[PDB]
Design a binder for this molecule. Structure first.
Ligand code: SF4
Ligand code: 2HP
Ligand code: 2HP
Length: 219
DNA sequence: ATGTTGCTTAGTCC
DNA sequence: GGACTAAGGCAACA
């Protein structure tokens, strides 16, 4: 299917009952946003359909993409990620605001699961269900040369996608594995506030990942 | 009030 | 693999 068909069918998806409930249950639970409209639906990917670099996250944040409708938009993860994308020359401007004119250059963003999960922890079954959408979405990204897994969950999801074994591809920040057709699989700590504010992942470390992805992508 | 909640990793143990 | 949790720093939240 094409992208219009993808977005159309993805947004009406309700295969995971626990997530279909959670994505709406969190609406109004955060003080700063009570009374405001929430997307509270599956989140479609965002970015350059001709991207050579794919940044693969974990899932929607309850008050992040689940609220704004755009990956990494409206929370601490995006406040960290978007400025770095611009600093690396991969976007039109530093901030991402729903409904704005932000453009990504050579990069596309999406995640393993597309509906906000309790505790930011989808079950093995929810991962298997949404993996069908990963097949469709990545199927619509023909130019990707570098797949960047943001976190352990994201990597394991990509490994499953590429039919690779966990034992031969452990998760460690900076890890780089070869893929068929001269492509690449890179692993990075996730951009979560839990990682960036605690010091496990710094702005310097992540910009480095982005620069390396550009290098391996011929950008 | 100032204590709690909430935003992955890495290791334990079965 | 699966279930569990200490640790990490900060600040909205209550
Ligand atoms: S997580 Fe994915 S598969 Fe499950 S309901 Fe949401 S879009 Fe559908
Ligand atoms: O809502 P996310 O894309 O920041 O997880
Ligand atoms: O932000 P608070 O401290 O007024 O609740």
């Amino acid at each position: 299917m094409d992208r219009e068909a993808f977005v159309q069918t993805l947004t009406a998806c309700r295969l995971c009952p626990r997530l279909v409930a959670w994505r709406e249950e969190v609406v109004g639970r955060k003080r700063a946003f009570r009374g405001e409209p929430y997307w509270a639906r599956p989140v479609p990917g965002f970015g350059d359909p001709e991207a050579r670099i794919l940044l693969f996250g974990l899932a929607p944040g309850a008050h992040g993409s689940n609220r704004t409708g755009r990956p990494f938009t409206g929370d601490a993860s995006g406040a960290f990620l978007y400025p770095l994308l611009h600093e690396a020359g991969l976007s039109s401007k530093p901030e991402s605001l729903p409904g704005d004119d932000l453009r990504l250059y050579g990069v596309y963003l999406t995640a393993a699961v597309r509906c906000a999960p309790p505790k930011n922890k989808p079950t093995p079954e929810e991962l298997r269900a949404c993996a069908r959408w990963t097949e469709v979405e990545l199927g619509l990204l023909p130019e990707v040369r570098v797949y960047v897994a943001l976190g352990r969950i994201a990597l394991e999801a990509l490994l499953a996608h590429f039919g690779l074994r966990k034992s031969a591809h452990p998760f460690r920040h900076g890890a780089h594995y070869p893929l068929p057709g001269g492509r690449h699989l890179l692993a990075s700590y996730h951009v979560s506030r839990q990682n960036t504010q605690t010091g496990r992942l710094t702005r310097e470390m992540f910009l480095e990942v982005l620069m390396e992805a550009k290098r391996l992508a011929g950008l």
